[PDB]
Chains A and B, each alone.
With several copies, the nearest count.
Chain A
Amino acid sequence: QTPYKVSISGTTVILTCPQYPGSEILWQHNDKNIGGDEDDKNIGSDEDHLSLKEFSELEQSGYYVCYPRGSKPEDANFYLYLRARVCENCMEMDVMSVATIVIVDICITGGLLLLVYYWSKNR
Protein backbone atom coordinates (compact mmCIF):
# COMPACT_ATOMS: atom_id res chain seq x y z
CA GLN A 1 0.00 0.00 0.00
CA THR A 2 1.28 3.44 -0.99
CA PRO A 3 0.28 6.02 1.64
CA TYR A 4 -0.75 9.65 1.33
CA LYS A 5 1.95 12.31 1.45
CA VAL A 6 1.21 15.06 3.98
CA SER A 7 3.43 18.15 4.20
CA ILE A 8 2.89 20.89 6.80
CA SER A 9 4.67 24.25 6.64
CA GLY A 10 3.54 27.12 8.85
CA THR A 11 -0.23 27.06 8.32
CA THR A 12 -0.19 25.36 4.90
CA VAL A 13 -0.96 21.66 4.43
CA ILE A 14 -0.35 19.81 1.16
CA LEU A 15 -1.81 16.34 0.55
CA THR A 16 -0.74 14.12 -2.34
CA CYS A 17 -2.86 11.41 -3.95
CA PRO A 18 -0.58 8.38 -4.48
CA GLN A 19 -2.45 5.62 -6.30
CA TYR A 20 -3.66 7.54 -9.40
CA PRO A 21 -0.57 8.72 -11.32
CA GLY A 22 -2.13 9.05 -14.77
CA SER A 23 -5.66 10.40 -14.43
CA GLU A 24 -7.52 13.42 -13.14
CA ILE A 25 -8.55 13.19 -9.49
CA LEU A 26 -11.07 14.78 -7.14
CA TRP A 27 -10.87 15.28 -3.39
CA GLN A 28 -13.65 14.98 -0.84
CA HIS A 29 -13.64 15.91 2.86
CA ASN A 30 -16.33 14.65 5.25
CA ASP A 31 -18.70 13.87 2.37
CA LYS A 32 -18.42 17.22 0.59
CA ASN A 33 -16.52 18.10 -2.57
CA ILE A 34 -13.44 20.24 -1.90
CA GLY A 35 -10.94 21.99 -4.15
CA GLY A 36 -11.02 22.49 -7.90
CA ASP A 37 -13.68 25.23 -7.83
CA GLU A 38 -11.30 27.87 -9.29
CA ASP A 39 -12.24 30.00 -6.25
CA ASP A 40 -11.73 29.91 -2.47
CA LYS A 41 -8.14 31.17 -2.56
CA ASN A 42 -7.21 29.29 0.62
CA ILE A 43 -7.95 25.94 -1.10
CA GLY A 44 -6.36 24.77 -4.34
CA SER A 45 -6.14 21.61 -6.44
CA ASP A 46 -3.26 21.67 -8.94
CA GLU A 47 -1.95 18.59 -10.75
CA ASP A 48 -2.58 15.81 -8.22
CA HIS A 49 -2.27 17.52 -4.85
CA LEU A 50 -4.60 19.47 -2.57
CA SER A 51 -3.23 22.63 -0.93
CA LEU A 52 -4.95 24.04 2.17
CA LYS A 53 -3.86 27.49 3.35
CA GLU A 54 -4.69 29.01 6.74
CA PHE A 55 -5.52 25.52 7.99
CA SER A 56 -7.94 25.52 10.92
CA GLU A 57 -7.70 22.53 13.25
CA LEU A 58 -11.26 22.86 14.55
CA GLU A 59 -12.98 22.88 11.15
CA GLN A 60 -10.60 21.30 8.61
CA SER A 61 -9.71 18.11 10.52
CA GLY A 62 -11.31 14.83 9.59
CA TYR A 63 -11.60 12.41 6.69
CA TYR A 64 -10.12 12.98 3.24
CA VAL A 65 -10.53 10.82 0.14
CA CYS A 66 -9.15 10.92 -3.40
CA TYR A 67 -11.06 9.36 -6.28
CA PRO A 68 -10.72 9.43 -10.08
CA ARG A 69 -13.06 11.65 -12.05
CA GLY A 70 -16.12 9.89 -13.44
CA SER A 71 -16.28 7.35 -10.60
CA LYS A 72 -18.95 7.52 -7.92
CA PRO A 73 -17.22 8.67 -4.68
CA GLU A 74 -18.15 5.66 -2.56
CA ASP A 75 -16.33 2.94 -4.52
CA ALA A 76 -13.18 4.48 -3.02
CA ASN A 77 -11.75 2.34 -0.23
CA PHE A 78 -8.76 4.29 1.12
CA TYR A 79 -9.34 7.28 3.41
CA LEU A 80 -7.01 9.55 5.37
CA TYR A 81 -7.86 10.70 8.89
CA LEU A 82 -6.02 13.99 9.40
CA ARG A 83 -5.78 15.98 12.62
CA ALA A 84 -3.06 18.64 12.60
CA ARG A 85 -2.28 21.47 15.02
CA VAL A 86 -0.81 24.24 12.89
CA CYS A 87 0.74 27.50 14.06
CA GLU A 88 2.09 30.68 12.51
CA ASN A 89 5.91 30.78 12.47
CA CYS A 90 5.84 27.54 14.50
CA MET A 91 8.51 25.10 13.32
CA GLU A 92 9.14 21.64 14.77
CA MET A 93 12.53 20.42 15.97
CA ASP A 94 13.66 17.49 18.09
CA VAL A 95 16.12 17.35 20.98
CA MET A 96 18.88 15.91 18.77
CA SER A 97 18.92 19.05 16.63
CA VAL A 98 19.28 21.30 19.69
CA ALA A 99 22.00 19.08 21.15
CA THR A 100 23.98 19.04 17.91
CA ILE A 101 23.66 22.80 17.36
CA VAL A 102 24.90 23.50 20.89
CA ILE A 103 27.78 21.03 20.45
CA VAL A 104 28.89 22.48 17.12
CA ASP A 105 28.68 26.02 18.53
CA ILE A 106 30.96 25.05 21.41
CA CYS A 107 33.36 23.27 19.05
CA ILE A 108 33.61 26.18 16.60
CA THR A 109 34.15 28.65 19.44
CA GLY A 110 36.95 26.50 20.85
CA GLY A 111 38.59 26.09 17.46
CA LEU A 112 38.47 29.82 16.77
CA LEU A 113 39.96 30.55 20.20
CA LEU A 114 42.82 28.11 19.61
CA LEU A 115 43.53 29.55 16.16
CA VAL A 116 43.57 33.13 17.45
CA TYR A 117 45.83 32.18 20.36
CA TYR A 118 48.32 30.45 18.06
CA TRP A 119 48.29 33.40 15.66
CA SER A 120 48.85 35.94 18.44
CA LYS A 121 51.44 34.00 20.45
CA ASN A 122 54.33 34.20 17.97
CA ARG A 123 54.02 37.92 17.19
Chain B
Amino acid sequence: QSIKGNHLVKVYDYQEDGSVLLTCDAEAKNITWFKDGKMIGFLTEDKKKWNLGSNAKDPRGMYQCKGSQNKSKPLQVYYRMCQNCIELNAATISGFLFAEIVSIFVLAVGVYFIAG
Protein backbone atom coordinates (compact mmCIF):
# COMPACT_ATOMS: atom_id res chain seq x y z
CA GLN B 1 0.00 0.00 0.00
CA SER B 2 2.35 2.69 -1.30
CA ILE B 3 1.50 6.02 -2.91
CA LYS B 4 4.51 5.48 -5.17
CA GLY B 5 2.93 2.72 -7.23
CA ASN B 6 -0.48 4.35 -7.67
CA HIS B 7 -2.17 2.63 -4.71
CA LEU B 8 -4.57 5.23 -3.32
CA VAL B 9 -7.77 3.45 -2.24
CA LYS B 10 -7.98 2.47 1.43
CA VAL B 11 -10.69 0.85 3.56
CA TYR B 12 -11.84 2.60 6.74
CA ASP B 13 -13.49 -0.11 8.83
CA TYR B 14 -14.65 -1.01 12.36
CA GLN B 15 -17.27 1.68 12.98
CA GLU B 16 -20.05 1.91 15.54
CA ASP B 17 -22.69 1.60 12.79
CA GLY B 18 -21.15 -1.24 10.76
CA SER B 19 -20.79 0.65 7.48
CA VAL B 20 -17.78 0.22 5.19
CA LEU B 21 -16.07 3.37 3.92
CA LEU B 22 -13.48 4.01 1.22
CA THR B 23 -10.82 6.73 1.30
CA CYS B 24 -8.89 8.22 -1.63
CA ASP B 25 -5.33 9.47 -1.19
CA ALA B 26 -5.63 12.15 -3.89
CA GLU B 27 -5.52 15.78 -2.75
CA ALA B 28 -7.93 17.08 -5.41
CA LYS B 29 -11.10 18.68 -4.09
CA ASN B 30 -13.55 16.62 -6.17
CA ILE B 31 -12.97 12.87 -6.39
CA THR B 32 -14.86 10.64 -8.82
CA TRP B 33 -15.39 6.97 -7.97
CA PHE B 34 -15.53 3.94 -10.27
CA LYS B 35 -16.75 0.40 -9.56
CA ASP B 36 -15.80 -2.25 -12.14
CA GLY B 37 -15.05 0.60 -14.54
CA LYS B 38 -18.39 2.41 -14.63
CA MET B 39 -18.70 5.67 -12.71
CA ILE B 40 -20.70 5.56 -9.47
CA GLY B 41 -20.55 9.18 -8.28
CA PHE B 42 -18.33 12.03 -7.17
CA LEU B 43 -17.52 13.91 -3.98
CA THR B 44 -16.46 17.45 -3.08
CA GLU B 45 -14.41 19.03 -0.29
CA ASP B 46 -17.13 18.42 2.31
CA LYS B 47 -17.16 14.61 2.01
CA LYS B 48 -13.90 12.66 2.13
CA LYS B 49 -15.20 9.07 2.23
CA TRP B 50 -17.41 6.90 0.04
CA ASN B 51 -20.04 4.77 1.77
CA LEU B 52 -20.49 1.12 0.76
CA GLY B 53 -23.29 0.42 3.22
CA SER B 54 -23.41 -2.13 6.00
CA ASN B 55 -20.88 -4.96 6.04
CA ALA B 56 -23.62 -7.52 6.75
CA LYS B 57 -24.53 -7.34 3.04
CA ASP B 58 -21.02 -8.55 2.08
CA PRO B 59 -19.76 -5.68 -0.12
CA ARG B 60 -17.63 -7.23 -2.86
CA GLY B 61 -16.12 -5.73 -5.98
CA MET B 62 -13.34 -3.60 -7.43
CA TYR B 63 -13.06 0.12 -6.72
CA GLN B 64 -11.00 3.04 -8.03
CA CYS B 65 -10.86 6.77 -7.32
CA LYS B 66 -9.63 9.67 -9.45
CA GLY B 67 -9.23 13.25 -8.34
CA SER B 68 -6.96 15.11 -10.75
CA GLN B 69 -4.13 13.14 -12.33
CA ASN B 70 -5.12 9.57 -13.22
CA LYS B 71 -7.10 6.54 -12.10
CA SER B 72 -5.59 4.73 -9.13
CA LYS B 73 -5.00 1.00 -9.26
CA PRO B 74 -8.09 -1.11 -8.49
CA LEU B 75 -8.69 -2.33 -4.96
CA GLN B 76 -10.65 -5.57 -4.60
CA VAL B 77 -12.92 -5.68 -1.54
CA TYR B 78 -14.30 -9.02 -0.34
CA TYR B 79 -16.52 -9.59 2.70
CA ARG B 80 -17.86 -12.80 4.24
CA MET B 81 -19.46 -12.22 7.63
CA CYS B 82 -22.00 -15.07 8.07
CA GLN B 83 -25.07 -13.07 8.93
CA ASN B 84 -26.94 -16.20 7.77
CA CYS B 85 -24.58 -19.05 8.71
CA ILE B 86 -26.12 -21.58 11.12
CA GLU B 87 -24.20 -23.53 13.76
CA LEU B 88 -25.24 -27.19 13.45
CA ASN B 89 -25.05 -28.07 17.13
CA ALA B 90 -27.21 -30.44 19.17
CA ALA B 91 -30.03 -27.98 19.91
CA THR B 92 -30.67 -27.06 16.27
CA ILE B 93 -30.86 -30.64 15.01
CA SER B 94 -32.93 -31.75 18.01
CA GLY B 95 -35.47 -28.99 17.41
CA PHE B 96 -35.55 -29.73 13.68
CA LEU B 97 -36.21 -33.44 14.28
CA PHE B 98 -38.89 -32.71 16.88
CA ALA B 99 -40.72 -30.29 14.58
CA GLU B 100 -40.44 -32.67 11.62
CA ILE B 101 -41.83 -35.70 13.46
CA VAL B 102 -44.67 -33.74 15.07
CA SER B 103 -45.73 -32.13 11.78
CA ILE B 104 -45.50 -35.43 9.89
CA PHE B 105 -47.63 -37.17 12.52
CA VAL B 106 -50.30 -34.44 12.44
CA LEU B 107 -50.47 -34.45 8.64
CA ALA B 108 -50.54 -38.26 8.61
CA VAL B 109 -53.54 -38.31 10.95
CA GLY B 110 -55.29 -35.68 8.86
CA VAL B 111 -54.80 -37.54 5.59
CA TYR B 112 -55.67 -40.85 7.26
CA PHE B 113 -59.10 -39.62 8.32
CA ILE B 114 -60.09 -38.12 4.96
CA ALA B 115 -59.08 -41.32 3.18
CA GLY B 116 -61.99 -42.97 1.38
The reply to whether A and B meet directly (CB within 8 Å) is yes
Which A residues fall within an 8 A CB radius of B? 3-4, 6, 8, 31, 40, 56-59, 63, 72-75, 77-85, 87, 89-94, 105, 109, 112-113, 116-117, 120-121
Partner of A87, one of B21, B62, B73, B85: B85
Task: Point out the residues of chain A lying under 8 angstroms from B80, CB to CB.
Answer: 6, 8, 83-85
Shortest distance from the beta carbon of A24 to any chain B beta carbon, whole Å: 21
Task: Point out the residues of chain A lying under 8 angstroms from B115, CB to CB.
Answer: 117, 120-121
The answer to whether the Cβ of B1 comes within 8 Å of any Cβ in the partner chain is yes
Q: Which 6 A-B pairs have the closest CB atoms?
A: A74-B5, A90-B85, A120-B115, A84-B80, A74-B2, A93-B84
Interface residues of B in 75-116 (CB under 8 A from A): 75-82, 84-89, 100, 104, 107-108, 111-112, 115-116
Shortest distance from the beta carbon of A102 to any chain B beta carbon, whole Å: 13
Shortest distance from the beta carbon of B23 to any chain A beta carbon, whole Å: 12
Q: How many A-B residue pairs have CB under 8 A?
A: 102
CA distance A89 to B46 in the complex (A): 24
Interface residues of B in 39-83 (CB under 8 A from A): 44, 46-49, 51, 55, 62, 73-82
CA distance A56 to B21 in the complex (A): 12
Partner of B76, one of A3, A56, A112: A3
| A81-B47 in contact (CB<8A) | no
Question: For residue B108, which residue of chain A has the nearest CB?
Answer: A116
CA distance A1 to B48 in the complex (A): 27
Known contacts A56-B47, A93-B86; A78/B108 CB under 8 A: no
| A79-B111 in contact (CB<8A) | no
CA distance A4 to B74 in the complex (A): 12
Shortest distance from the beta carbon of A68 to any chain B beta carbon, whole Å: 15
A73-B2, A81-B11 are known; give 14 further A-B pairs, CB within 8 A: A8-B80, A58-B21, A77-B73, A78-B76, A79-B1, A80-B76, A82-B78, A83-B13, A84-B79, A85-B82, A90-B82, A91-B88, A105-B100, A113-B107
Task: Point out the residues of chain A lying under 8 angstroms from B38, CB to CB.
Answer: none
